[PDB]
């Protein structure tokens, strides 16, 4: 029984970063070397674990988080980062144990005149905690007067569309991201490498 990474990495549609998708992986064998050595990924960075040592370790659960962001935001998907993405959309903990994989998806996620399907949270009063997913669409109150669900002066729609156009500069193009998190609790290890 191989791990279903194909349905995570090769999904036709990816989530918006504010509503990031989480896939729980368990009771399967995973060959992480076919991923680490693949030419299709422009970013493959591991934290708390050696990438060339993944096939020899065992974990209780593996999480595969996936979403789309700009290319120049992929650097925020790492421990200790700040920015609109790290602070208000997807936050990794300082002690993160896992891998961050990314690749350019301008061919799938951009369209003539703009692709406004992909969104990110622009307004939030405070930073997210690690692995927090805020899907609120409540009107953001930027002044003392309540908004009453009405977008207007000092009452902003908290989410913004990226508006990916194929003509965008590479750092502003959409990138598909997959974050593999490895947890080891006081329970038997169900996810292992090919041994």
């Amino acid at each position: 029984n191989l791990c279903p990474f194909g349905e995570v990495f090769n999904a036709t549609r990816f989530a918006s970063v504010y509503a990031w998708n989480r896939k729980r992986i368990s009771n399967c064998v995973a060959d992480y070397s076919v991923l680490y050595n693949s030419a299709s990924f422009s970013t493959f960075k591991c934290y708390g674990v050696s990438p060339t040592k993944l096939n020899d370790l065992c974990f209780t659960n593996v999480y595969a988080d996936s979403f789309v962001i700009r290319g120049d935001e992929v650097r925020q998907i790492a421990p200790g980062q700040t920015g609109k993405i790290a602070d208000y959309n997807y936050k990794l903990p300082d002690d993160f144990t896992g891998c961050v994989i990314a690749w350019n998806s301008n061919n799938l996620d951009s369209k003539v005149g703009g692709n406004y399907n992909y969104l990110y949270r622009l307004f939030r009063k405070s930073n997210l905690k690690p692995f927090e997913r805020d899907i609120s669409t409540e009107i953001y109150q930027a002044g003392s007067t309540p908004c009453n669900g009405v977008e207007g002066f000092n009452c902003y729609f908290p989410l913004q569309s990226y508006g990916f156009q194929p003509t965008n500069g590479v750092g502003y193009q959409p990138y598909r991201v997959v974050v593999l998190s490895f947890e080891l609790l006081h329970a038997p290890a169900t996810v292992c490498g090919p041994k």
Partner: antibody
Amino acid sequence: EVQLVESGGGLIQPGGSLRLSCAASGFTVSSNYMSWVRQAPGKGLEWVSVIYSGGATYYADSVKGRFTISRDNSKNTLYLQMNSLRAEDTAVYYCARGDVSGYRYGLDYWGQGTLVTVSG
Amino acid sequence: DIQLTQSPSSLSASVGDRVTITCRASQGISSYLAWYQQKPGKAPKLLIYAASTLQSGVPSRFSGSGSGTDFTLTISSLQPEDFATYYCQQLISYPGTFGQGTKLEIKR
């Protein structure tokens, strides 16, 4: 009615320090992206710094390591601490509501500006 | 980094004339652009954001167009009070570069 009022500008010798203040009314400083922008006499506009509601701060390469942006929630005021000032820092400094990166709204409200003259 | 080339540097036009100011970005920035109007001794005033959305209170003679690399600010019928320096600004990344500016004077 939105009001932004800068103060603290004036003459300062090269190598000196100054702290600018921007008292705001009509919106909550701690809930918004707040920026500082400067304009040297007879020149164009230059974004200097931003503070996010969550606390993140960003700076132009020309002021990095010398300037610090901050705010006081209870006073609804924005600050710019400027150290090791040079002649090329001479400008009208404006506080503005908004951000300049992934922020389509631009800078909608600006104060009147405070002139900083770096001279001996 | 993105370069913003605003043109022309200066413009002279009669009252009632149609005036166009252009801004070209070195890379595609979608609609992340604003236009500002600055009068003597005053702070810049936001006219248009998201490349074509008029800011509240701005007269209908001002309009913005473009997406990607080429952007235009048009005044369809120039009024004496429109004498000002106009600036474009990219809003896609730090440092939110402003264009060089266009000084618009009125022929009379």
